[PDB]
Amino acid sequence: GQFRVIGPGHPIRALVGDEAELPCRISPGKNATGMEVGWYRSPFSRVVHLYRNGKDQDAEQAPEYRGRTELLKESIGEGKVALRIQNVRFSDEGGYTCFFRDAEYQEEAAVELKVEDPFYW
């Protein structure tokens, strides 16, 4: 085996109508720009976002995420990425799984999203 994939040890907190950033990275950090990086949605494992061969693969993500997601690559050269989901809604709450795949090697990490409507604060 090679690297492990890890996410934050806390849930991500987002507000309805705003953006949420779900981070994940490989450890130890190394260049992931050339790897396949993906995010899937619990519990049917629908694809939230898939990056491969240096491109976001719009056609491979589930229809509902089209136009709502971006993979932030600022730190991908150091093995870290963040899935940015726009216009968050309560239905986005829950579990997500991130994965980094290098050739035949792949690892994953679980990320949880909590959502609140600030109007009701």
Residue 40 belongs to domain with CATH number: 2.60.40.10
Q: What is the resolution of the experimental data for this entry, in Å?
A: 1.7
- Find where tokens 């934050």 sit: 8
CB 35 within 8 A of CB 101: yes
Query: In angstroms, how far apart are the furthest CA atoms of the chain?
Result: 48
Q: How far apart are CA 52 and CA 35, in angstroms?
A: 6
Task: Show the domain range for 4.
Answer: 1-121
Tokens representing 108 are 């994953």
- 27 vs 10, 65, 103, 111, CA distance in Å? 18, 28, 17, 16
Nearest to 35 by CA among 73, 7, 69: 73
Q: How far apart are CA 111 and CA 82, in angstroms?
A: 11
What's the domain count of the chain?
1
Tokens representing 121 are 């604060």
Backbone torsion region of residue 118, taken as left when φ is above 0, otherwise alpha when ψ lies between -120 and 50, otherwise beta: alpha
CB 82 within 8 A of CB 21: yes
